[PDB]
RNA sequence: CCAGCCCUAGAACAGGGCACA
């Protein structure tokens, strides 16, 4: 197996020089061997990507999925860790920077079919990884406007060269 | 029918990452002005409803302990009073349940 | 800015809902009665 | 005096920042205050805050984002308190939103903030060759359909009144001002420094003197968002983006014995309490009328 | 095509749906407040209103008596229906029940759940959704409009 | 088909394996302080003068 | 310097955890600038246990020291105090030594702080103290 | 409901005018346009009036199917193929 | 504008209504 999301939380940075902007705190947390499915957990992980922690908890409280409670507990433990261990005041000043889900070790069973046939049934397990960064959530990217489209097209036209001409 | 070829990860992602399959965000979430917990604008508050449900379960437990039988239902109205309360002139003649707990702030005397 | 969904009855009070209803009703009645005589205000050439 | 409007705004902001730096340096050390939370939701909560640095907005940030989004005003144990005002001593805080049972204080604060924003729009939506002097913001109740602001224009401007196009341009400027998030900053200063802050508006000087005469310490409250500074009573809302709907309803010229004043009346509704289109039109038609409340 | 259908299919058929609604009505008459699925409670509300009307029809009415005998499975609730529920619903016309959607069931099915309650019961009042006060900004503006309209007449 | 998981980390020590240790625990120090010195409240004012 | 070996040789097993546990994930910048009052031996005690025949001699020494302490965060930001302020501290270090041991090095055992000592310097950040997390069937009780 | 009517240039009326049923007189022929009664996703027998297979003479799970939909040589089905859908 | 609630609209999503009463 591999356990690096946990050790990602033990790196220490050198002290900051007077004048350098304050580095935002990054908190890595994870839950291993969840009975939920990998893709069904990826859906809930994608739901709460880039959102504030309070908004993510508000969405997960009313999500009807089973992994919603697991992700909510993981987010709450990550907030508690960020407040206690790391020097992070304003416990509501965290946003979900990274939120993905990986697979775990499966359990192989037999699924009977009929006429003496069977199938390989896989009891699936998943991991949920989350990363909380101190600060306001980054603004959502807006779709490209017509002015930007026209600018990019004009620049593409201006970048042309006479090919195989020299 | 059997599949003719293996579907690639590209088409698989295009299928199961379409916004039709993504979880939609809910915009009807608000806070409860009483306890501060989260609730939907069209649904009762879970915390307050749990409080009321626990109080109702206790009241029903006591009112069922009062009636030693399964088919013994009162033919008159019922009134629940808490510690330090007395039945009024309008509440007399009804069945009386007495709770040792003090009257909650949300339960109105009426 | 996560703006929430709103309708016309969310922020109204127990006393302003009937007032709003009757106000819109009287406005609609007046507007429908104003157009009852179309041939005397400014009709187009027949 | 030979002073450009941009130079006047620059010097006003410079003296404001100097007074703010003096207020900050008045406290050399970092004292810890213990502020309780007497709200109905989470009682018994205690915040160990910094003296003259931490704010009720910082308390709300410690609590939850829902508090920062909903709570507009704060009640520090005896009186309303805006979110971006640093706390002074150990106290107890109660947060106040728009949908409270007695939201009168928040209504007054929102009315004052809307009046201040409208005055900021009017002061800068006019020609530089003309003189424009804001008198004050008449404290009208919320039952009145509009918030009013008193202006005095150049002498050669007393014959014309703004048309619907001009009112729409004022509304567009106010919406553009709302678009950019500008927090309302407060400052407890003295009349001595407020006089040199303004130094040009005789009406503003008279208002500052009248507000300082009723105070035994001669302390007046200045408010500033972006580059606009104004004197007003009571606290304000934390941000401008709280104002969702905003319209400049009308202007009314009142001619007195000494001079005439243009009362600009406008209407606004928050993001939390935005109304339907027809309701907004009815309220706007009511606000188009005259509002006369001074004492 | 289910145009103009008013009853939803429940249980193992029409008779099973009738029996389910009958059990729910018996429980509602007994406890004055129950909680079930949203669809079953929405189907039961009309039967509860009609049962209160049949109870208001009187004790000596043989039709109402046999209707109560059929519906109320526990036979100790018929005197209750005729001497507690019907007498206390006299000035009212159709406002006998109150149905409110409660959060989804905490079980794995996550069923949409409602709570039905006979008005005027001896139970803690549910957290009913109260409208905003007249002291709100918008409500005060509408009050000013109303006062102007009153003064204009 | 019949397979299970392993490595369920649990910490459970009992008095029997605690006392059946072949060699005692060698301690290079004690637990805490036996006789704590309670200083007089006038140290802040007597530290101002040397003699 | 995070020299756990020499730290174990200097301080004892009761002094090591209390000074390494809450700091193993932080950066320290500690220095020694001045000392107004020389250290003074206050009292000397000895604990003799006859079950093994072992004697531990503890010596309390009062120190008036002038130190500069700056505890940084695991991300590099200042947490506790500045690295240039020479704060004055008064402590009572209790050293201990096993007298039966042939080597018997002098090791710092405990750190007594008087109860009337001035409170420590305030932290740079703010703290929220949560109230009692209430169950639905429980009501808040305001203490006065 | 908001509809558009193609009129001549001499039969134009001012916008905002009311229109009444006496616009039509007893004895006249009219055209009536409306959205018909929607029966949802209906089968081929109710949508196109196709005949089904016999009821019980051996047929297995086909009593309402459309049957053959195209020809073997075309190796595809034509766009004008009658198939179940909205009705 | 679309939270919710009805529908002669609908597999889901969509679509029409929710002031007279
Ligand atoms: Mg077999
Ligand atoms: Mg498989
Ligand atoms: Mg396979
Ligand atoms: Mg249909
Ligand atoms: Mg046939
Ligand atoms: Mg066959
Ligand atoms: Mg068959
Ligand atoms: Mg067969
Ligand atoms: Mg072909
Ligand atoms: Mg619609
Ligand atoms: Zn609640």
mmCIF file of C-alpha atoms in Angstrom, chain H:
data_model
loop_
_atom_site.group_PDB
_atom_site.id
_atom_site.type_symbol
_atom_site.label_atom_id
_atom_site.label_comp_id
_atom_site.label_asym_id
_atom_site.label_seq_id
_atom_site.Cartn_x
_atom_site.Cartn_y
_atom_site.Cartn_z
ATOM 1 C CA UNK H 1 -50.937 32.391 -24.320
ATOM 2 C CA UNK H 2 -49.437 34.793 -26.867
ATOM 3 C CA UNK H 3 -50.046 34.132 -30.560
ATOM 4 C CA UNK H 4 -49.235 35.814 -33.872
ATOM 5 C CA UNK H 5 -51.784 36.346 -36.655
ATOM 6 C CA UNK H 6 -50.870 37.230 -40.238
ATOM 7 C CA UNK H 7 -53.139 40.124 -41.226
ATOM 8 C CA UNK H 8 -53.201 42.508 -44.159
ATOM 9 C CA UNK H 9 -51.974 46.088 -43.963
ATOM 10 C CA UNK H 10 -55.527 47.483 -44.008
ATOM 11 C CA UNK H 11 -56.824 45.214 -41.209
ATOM 12 C CA UNK H 12 -54.256 46.299 -38.614
ATOM 13 C CA UNK H 13 -55.526 47.387 -35.199
ATOM 14 C CA UNK H 14 -53.842 49.542 -32.579
ATOM 15 C CA UNK H 15 -51.996 47.474 -29.945
ATOM 16 C CA UNK H 16 -53.804 47.432 -26.616
ATOM 17 C CA UNK H 17 -57.320 47.099 -28.044
ATOM 18 C CA UNK H 18 -59.736 44.453 -26.709
ATOM 19 C CA UNK H 19 -61.315 41.834 -28.953
ATOM 20 C CA UNK H 20 -64.644 40.116 -28.317
ATOM 21 C CA UNK H 21 -66.386 36.975 -29.537
ATOM 22 C CA UNK H 22 -68.810 39.062 -31.603
ATOM 23 C CA UNK H 23 -65.790 39.387 -33.886
ATOM 24 C CA UNK H 24 -67.246 36.215 -35.430
ATOM 25 C CA UNK H 25 -70.830 36.134 -36.646
ATOM 26 C CA UNK H 26 -73.321 33.230 -36.591
ATOM 27 C CA UNK H 27 -72.633 31.347 -39.802
ATOM 28 C CA UNK H 28 -68.967 31.352 -40.792
ATOM 29 C CA UNK H 29 -66.052 28.935 -41.046
ATOM 30 C CA UNK H 30 -63.045 29.201 -38.739
ATOM 31 C CA UNK H 31 -59.668 27.580 -38.136
ATOM 32 C CA UNK H 32 -58.796 26.416 -34.621
ATOM 33 C CA UNK H 33 -55.191 25.793 -33.552
ATOM 34 C CA UNK H 34 -54.181 24.290 -30.218
ATOM 35 C CA UNK H 35 -51.875 21.818 -28.512
ATOM 36 C CA UNK H 36 -53.590 18.436 -28.578
ATOM 37 C CA UNK H 37 -54.081 16.163 -25.570
ATOM 38 C CA UNK H 38 -50.623 14.798 -24.822
ATOM 39 C CA UNK H 39 -50.522 11.058 -24.154
ATOM 40 C CA UNK H 40 -46.821 10.866 -23.299
ATOM 41 C CA UNK H 41 -44.368 8.270 -24.562
ATOM 42 C CA UNK H 42 -46.801 5.937 -26.315
ATOM 43 C CA UNK H 43 -46.219 2.622 -28.031
ATOM 44 C CA UNK H 44 -46.216 2.073 -31.762
ATOM 45 C CA UNK H 45 -49.740 0.605 -31.778
ATOM 46 C CA UNK H 46 -51.293 3.711 -30.215
ATOM 47 C CA UNK H 47 -48.954 6.182 -31.927
ATOM 48 C CA UNK H 48 -49.127 4.877 -35.506
ATOM 49 C CA UNK H 49 -52.077 2.481 -35.461
ATOM 50 C CA UNK H 50 -49.899 -0.540 -36.183
ATOM 51 C CA UNK H 51 -51.389 -4.009 -35.968
ATOM 52 C CA UNK H 52 -50.004 -6.343 -33.332
ATOM 53 C CA UNK H 53 -49.216 -10.025 -33.499
ATOM 54 C CA UNK H 54 -51.817 -12.672 -32.560
ATOM 55 C CA UNK H 55 -52.659 -12.940 -28.878
ATOM 56 C CA UNK H 56 -52.055 -16.558 -27.901
ATOM 57 C CA UNK H 57 -51.152 -18.748 -30.915
ATOM 58 C CA UNK H 58 -47.566 -19.216 -29.698
ATOM 59 C CA UNK H 59 -46.215 -15.652 -29.786
ATOM 60 C CA UNK H 60 -43.603 -14.946 -27.106
ATOM 61 C CA UNK H 61 -43.248 -11.413 -25.719
ATOM 62 C CA UNK H 62 -44.178 -9.626 -28.942
ATOM 63 C CA UNK H 63 -47.909 -8.800 -28.762
ATOM 64 C CA UNK H 64 -47.325 -5.042 -29.197
ATOM 65 C CA UNK H 65 -43.880 -4.746 -30.815
ATOM 66 C CA UNK H 66 -43.474 -2.919 -34.148
ATOM 67 C CA UNK H 67 -41.947 -5.983 -35.812
ATOM 68 C CA UNK H 68 -39.406 -5.470 -38.568
ATOM 69 C CA UNK H 69 -38.186 -1.883 -38.815
ATOM 70 C CA UNK H 70 -36.079 -1.948 -42.004
ATOM 71 C CA UNK H 71 -34.564 -4.200 -44.667
ATOM 72 C CA UNK H 72 -31.444 -6.338 -44.439
ATOM 73 C CA UNK H 73 -29.694 -4.926 -47.506
ATOM 74 C CA UNK H 74 -30.056 -1.280 -46.472
ATOM 75 C CA UNK H 75 -28.061 -2.138 -43.303
ATOM 76 C CA UNK H 76 -29.767 0.773 -41.516
ATOM 77 C CA UNK H 77 -33.188 2.217 -40.757
ATOM 78 C CA UNK H 78 -34.671 5.155 -42.628
ATOM 79 C CA UNK H 79 -35.294 8.512 -40.906
ATOM 80 C CA UNK H 80 -39.023 8.298 -41.616
ATOM 81 C CA UNK H 81 -39.334 5.112 -39.579
ATOM 82 C CA UNK H 82 -42.407 4.962 -37.350
ATOM 83 C CA UNK H 83 -41.205 4.173 -33.830
ATOM 84 C CA UNK H 84 -42.507 4.679 -30.278
ATOM 85 C CA UNK H 85 -42.183 8.128 -28.785
ATOM 86 C CA UNK H 86 -44.043 11.238 -27.722
ATOM 87 C CA UNK H 87 -47.686 11.456 -28.785
#
